[PDB]
Design an enzyme around this catalytic site. Structure first.
Site, PDB file in Angstrom:
ATOM      1  N   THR A   1     -11.817  -8.973   5.789  1.00 22.06           N
ATOM      2  CA  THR A   1     -12.549  -9.397   4.605  1.00 22.06           C
ATOM      3  C   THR A   1     -13.874  -9.995   5.054  1.00 22.06           C
ATOM      4  O   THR A   1     -13.924 -10.719   6.045  1.00 22.06           O
ATOM      5  CB  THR A   1     -11.789 -10.410   3.800  1.00 22.06           C
ATOM      6  OG1 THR A   1     -11.891 -11.676   4.459  1.00 22.06           O
ATOM      7  CG2 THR A   1     -10.329  -9.978   3.659  1.00 22.06           C
TER       8      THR A   1
ATOM      9  N   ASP B   1      -7.774 -10.602  11.430  1.00 23.58           N
ATOM     10  CA  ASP B   1      -7.586 -10.621  10.015  1.00 23.58           C
ATOM     11  C   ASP B   1      -7.339 -12.015   9.441  1.00 23.58           C
ATOM     12  O   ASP B   1      -6.711 -12.107   8.412  1.00 23.58           O
ATOM     13  CB  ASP B   1      -6.479  -9.649   9.548  1.00 23.58           C
ATOM     14  CG  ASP B   1      -6.688  -9.219   8.057  1.00 23.58           C
ATOM     15  OD1 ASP B   1      -7.807  -9.442   7.516  1.00 23.58           O
ATOM     16  OD2 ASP B   1      -5.729  -8.735   7.424  1.00 23.58           O
TER      17      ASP B   1
ATOM     18  N   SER C   1       0.771  -1.242   0.000  1.00 19.24           N
ATOM     19  CA  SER C   1       0.000   0.000   0.000  1.00 19.24           C
ATOM     20  C   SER C   1       0.821   1.324   0.000  1.00 19.24           C
ATOM     21  O   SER C   1       0.359   2.345  -0.520  1.00 19.24           O
ATOM     22  CB  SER C   1      -0.996  -0.061   1.167  1.00 19.24           C
ATOM     23  OG  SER C   1      -1.447   1.222   1.522  1.00 19.24           O
ATOM     24  N   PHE C   2       2.036   1.308   0.559  1.00 20.21           N
ATOM     25  CA  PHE C   2       2.807   2.542   0.739  1.00 20.21           C
ATOM     26  C   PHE C   2       4.136   2.511   0.025  1.00 20.21           C
ATOM     27  O   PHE C   2       4.912   3.474   0.112  1.00 20.21           O
ATOM     28  CB  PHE C   2       3.073   2.779   2.209  1.00 20.21           C
ATOM     29  CG  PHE C   2       1.898   2.500   3.094  1.00 20.21           C
ATOM     30  CD1 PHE C   2       0.827   3.384   3.142  1.00 20.21           C
ATOM     31  CD2 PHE C   2       1.883   1.366   3.922  1.00 20.21           C
ATOM     32  CE1 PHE C   2      -0.256   3.133   3.984  1.00 20.21           C
ATOM     33  CE2 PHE C   2       0.821   1.110   4.780  1.00 20.21           C
ATOM     34  CZ  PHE C   2      -0.254   1.997   4.822  1.00 20.21           C
TER      35      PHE C   2
ATOM     36  N   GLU D   1      -5.389 -15.862   2.531  1.00 20.97           N
ATOM     37  CA  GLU D   1      -4.372 -14.958   1.984  1.00 20.97           C
ATOM     38  C   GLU D   1      -3.248 -14.591   3.001  1.00 20.97           C
ATOM     39  O   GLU D   1      -2.112 -14.268   2.596  1.00 20.97           O
ATOM     40  CB  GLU D   1      -5.036 -13.675   1.444  1.00 20.97           C
ATOM     41  CG  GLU D   1      -4.051 -12.493   1.286  1.00 20.97           C
ATOM     42  CD  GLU D   1      -4.743 -11.147   0.954  1.00 20.97           C
ATOM     43  OE1 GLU D   1      -5.777 -11.171   0.206  1.00 20.97           O
ATOM     44  OE2 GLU D   1      -4.263 -10.072   1.442  1.00 20.97           O
ATOM     45  N   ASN D   2      -3.538 -14.658   4.294  1.00 26.07           N
ATOM     46  CA  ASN D   2      -2.557 -14.208   5.320  1.00 26.07           C
ATOM     47  C   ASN D   2      -1.806 -15.396   5.891  1.00 26.07           C
ATOM     48  O   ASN D   2      -1.143 -15.271   6.903  1.00 26.07           O
ATOM     49  CB  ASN D   2      -3.280 -13.408   6.416  1.00 26.07           C
ATOM     50  CG  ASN D   2      -3.585 -11.970   5.974  1.00 26.07           C
ATOM     51  OD1 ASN D   2      -3.108 -11.551   4.930  1.00 26.07           O
ATOM     52  ND2 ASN D   2      -4.405 -11.231   6.737  1.00 26.07           N
TER      53      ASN D   2
ATOM     54  N   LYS E   1      -7.559 -15.229   7.365  1.00 27.29           N
ATOM     55  CA  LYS E   1      -8.074 -15.538   6.022  1.00 27.29           C
ATOM     56  C   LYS E   1      -6.944 -16.244   5.284  1.00 27.29           C
ATOM     57  O   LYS E   1      -5.820 -15.998   5.606  1.00 27.29           O
ATOM     58  CB  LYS E   1      -8.464 -14.241   5.270  1.00 27.29           C
ATOM     59  CG  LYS E   1      -7.324 -13.280   4.994  1.00 27.29           C
ATOM     60  CD  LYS E   1      -7.851 -12.150   4.058  1.00 27.29           C
ATOM     61  CE  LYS E   1      -6.885 -10.958   3.976  1.00 27.29           C
ATOM     62  NZ  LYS E   1      -7.402  -9.764   3.140  1.00 27.29           N
TER      63      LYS E   1
ATOM     64  N   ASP F   1       0.515 -11.196   8.285  1.00 27.46           N
ATOM     65  CA  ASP F   1       0.169  -9.736   8.187  1.00 27.46           C
ATOM     66  C   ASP F   1      -0.580  -9.205   9.438  1.00 27.46           C
ATOM     67  O   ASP F   1      -1.716  -9.595   9.745  1.00 27.46           O
ATOM     68  CB  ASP F   1      -0.685  -9.469   6.881  1.00 27.46           C
ATOM     69  CG  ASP F   1      -1.189  -7.954   6.694  1.00 27.46           C
ATOM     70  OD1 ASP F   1      -0.959  -7.004   7.497  1.00 27.46           O
ATOM     71  OD2 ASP F   1      -1.879  -7.713   5.672  1.00 27.46           O
TER      72      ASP F   1
ATOM     73  N   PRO G   1       9.710 -18.282   0.912  1.00 23.12           N
ATOM     74  CA  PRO G   1       9.130 -18.516  -0.404  1.00 23.12           C
ATOM     75  C   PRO G   1       8.384 -19.843  -0.274  1.00 23.12           C
ATOM     76  O   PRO G   1       8.909 -20.837   0.252  1.00 23.12           O
ATOM     77  CB  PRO G   1      10.367 -18.633  -1.320  1.00 23.12           C
ATOM     78  CG  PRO G   1      11.490 -19.011  -0.390  1.00 23.12           C
ATOM     79  CD  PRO G   1      11.013 -18.956   1.042  1.00 23.12           C
TER      80      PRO G   1
ATOM     81  N   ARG H   1       7.164  -0.391  -2.309  1.00 24.77           N
ATOM     82  CA  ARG H   1       7.566  -1.712  -2.758  1.00 24.77           C
ATOM     83  C   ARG H   1       7.970  -2.669  -1.633  1.00 24.77           C
ATOM     84  O   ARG H   1       8.329  -2.256  -0.565  1.00 24.77           O
ATOM     85  CB  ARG H   1       8.672  -1.607  -3.847  1.00 24.77           C
ATOM     86  CG  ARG H   1       9.538  -0.294  -3.859  1.00 24.77           C
ATOM     87  CD  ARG H   1      10.441  -0.211  -5.144  1.00 24.77           C
ATOM     88  NE  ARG H   1       9.666  -0.408  -6.375  1.00 24.77           N
ATOM     89  CZ  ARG H   1      10.167  -0.354  -7.618  1.00 24.77           C
ATOM     90  NH1 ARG H   1      11.458  -0.107  -7.809  1.00 24.77           N
ATOM     91  NH2 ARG H   1       9.371  -0.541  -8.680  1.00 24.77           N
TER      92      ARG H   1
ATOM     93  N   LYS I   1       9.870  -4.540   3.518  1.00 25.50           N
ATOM     94  CA  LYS I   1       8.827  -3.638   3.141  1.00 25.50           C
ATOM     95  C   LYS I   1       9.346  -2.195   3.249  1.00 25.50           C
ATOM     96  O   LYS I   1       9.854  -1.767   4.292  1.00 25.50           O
ATOM     97  CB  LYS I   1       7.535  -3.802   3.981  1.00 25.50           C
ATOM     98  CG  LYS I   1       6.899  -5.176   4.003  1.00 25.50           C
ATOM     99  CD  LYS I   1       5.451  -5.187   4.629  1.00 25.50           C
ATOM    100  CE  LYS I   1       5.400  -4.749   6.128  1.00 25.50           C
ATOM    101  NZ  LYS I   1       4.117  -5.112   6.919  1.00 25.50           N
TER     102      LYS I   1
ATOM    103  N   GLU J   1      11.111 -11.621   7.831  1.00 25.52           N
ATOM    104  CA  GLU J   1      11.500 -12.990   7.454  1.00 25.52           C
ATOM    105  C   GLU J   1      11.000 -13.245   6.063  1.00 25.52           C
ATOM    106  O   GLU J   1       9.863 -12.905   5.761  1.00 25.52           O
ATOM    107  CB  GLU J   1      10.811 -13.987   8.398  1.00 25.52           C
ATOM    108  CG  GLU J   1      11.325 -15.381   8.345  1.00 25.52           C
ATOM    109  CD  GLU J   1      10.474 -16.336   9.253  1.00 25.52           C
ATOM    110  OE1 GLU J   1       9.721 -15.884  10.148  1.00 25.52           O
ATOM    111  OE2 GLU J   1      10.571 -17.549   9.050  1.00 25.52           O
TER     112      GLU J   1
ATOM    113  N   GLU K   1       1.002 -19.195  -0.674  1.00 25.70           N
ATOM    114  CA  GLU K   1      -0.041 -18.875   0.264  1.00 25.70           C
ATOM    115  C   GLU K   1      -1.232 -19.882   0.178  1.00 25.70           C
ATOM    116  O   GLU K   1      -1.516 -20.419  -0.904  1.00 25.70           O
ATOM    117  CB  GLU K   1      -0.386 -17.375   0.146  1.00 25.70           C
ATOM    118  CG  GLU K   1      -1.871 -16.965   0.141  1.00 25.70           C
ATOM    119  CD  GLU K   1      -2.217 -16.054  -1.066  1.00 25.70           C
ATOM    120  OE1 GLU K   1      -2.273 -16.568  -2.226  1.00 25.70           O
ATOM    121  OE2 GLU K   1      -2.467 -14.841  -0.869  1.00 25.70           O
TER     122      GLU K   1
END
Length: 321
Positions: free
Chosen positions: A190, A155, A42-43, A159-160, A157, A173, A113, A45, A61, A110, A116
């Protein structure tokens, strides 16, 4: 019992020490060699970096301070970093270093690879009850640890959730996490995962995390979420309805657990009763769960995934970072 009570006392000592004296400027940009862009936040790369002495890789981040300020995320950004530097648990991604320069904040995470659970569930369709139980077990102990610290995750879900190289869950996250005693009112998350009391703005506590676990467990085992619709608001209405149907293949035990997690009555919802998390850990659906070997990472995994400006900006705003 007794070992769990000593462990949590130690957990909380370890946390409160970092929470009340957060570490700042623990590294410097010039210690890191830039490799490639991992993605966009969001802010700014997210960059893959290699530390120059250690050769270890991280996902750094970069947060543009002025973009933080105009997206109105100052206190959230500060809070996320304060919580990340203070926690430690096998299934939580680590904040390895943090520092700031004239333009940016940097959270050196951390890097694992992996893949998700979002994509993995999509491609495989759904998990066997044992495969899902193995994931859900790590979420239970993660929330046990986070709630002893008075942290609400808020949060959960797919995706996290990533599946790391030993096939274990890593929680990824902390954007919405909040330390609170008692209650709080923010609408966030979500839609598919929100508990009814969140939607209805009546205030809520850490019990929303156990509802969201009921959702995830349901989704991993069905291959789709229990409350779903085309528009967020229809999702909201289906959750508040609360009528839930289980696929024909759900075991008797799984259904029974799900009814105690997706429970609208807080006086009845599992996790937040006098018996705490043991109401979950002692349920028949988890009878075959070895909780200590889960925590130690000794249980065999169900599967192992595939092979700057010259001037200083917003100084007062980010002083505690």
């Amino acid at each position: 019992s007794s070992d769990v009570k000593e462990f949590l006392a130690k957990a909380k000592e370890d946390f409160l020490k970092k929470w009340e004296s957060p570490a700042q400027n623990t590294a410097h940009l010039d210690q890191f060699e830039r490799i490639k862009t991992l993605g966009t936040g969001s802010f700014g790369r997210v960059m893959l970096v290699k530390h120059k002495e250690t050769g270890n890789h991280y996902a750094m981040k970069i947060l543009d301070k002025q973009k933080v300020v105009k997206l109105k995320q100052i206190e959230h950004t500060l809070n996320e970093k304060r919580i990340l530097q203070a926690v430690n648990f096998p299934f939580l991604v680590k904040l390895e270093f943090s520092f700031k320069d004239n333009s940016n904040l940097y959270m050196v995470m951390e890097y694992v690879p992996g893949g998700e659970m979002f994509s993995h569930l999509r491609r495989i369709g759904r998990f066997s009850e044992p495969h899902a139980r193995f994931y859900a077990a790590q979420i239970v102990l993660t929330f046990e640890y986070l709630h002893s610290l008075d942290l609400i995750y808020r949060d959960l879900k797919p995706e996290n959730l990533l599946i790391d190289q030993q096939g274990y869950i890593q929680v990824t996250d902390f954007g919405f996490a909040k330390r609170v005693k008692g209650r709080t009112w923010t609408l966030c998350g979500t839609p598919e995962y929100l508990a009814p009391e969140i939607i209805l703005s009546k205030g809520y506590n850490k019990a929303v995390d156990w509802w969201a676990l009921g959702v995830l467990i349901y989704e991993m085992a069905a291959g789709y979420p229990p409350f779903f619709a085309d528009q967020p608001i229809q999702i909201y209405e289906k959750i508040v309805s609360g009528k839930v149907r289980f696929p024909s293949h759900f075991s008797s035990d799984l259904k029974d657990l799900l009814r105690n997690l997706l429970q609208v009555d807080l006086t009845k919802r599992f996790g937040n009763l006098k018996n705490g998390v043991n109401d979950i850990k002692n349920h028949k659906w988890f009878a075959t769960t070895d909780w200590i070997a889960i925590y130690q990472r000794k249980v065999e995994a169900p599967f192992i995934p595939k092979f700057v400006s010259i001037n200083e900006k917003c100084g007062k705003e980010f002083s505690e970072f």
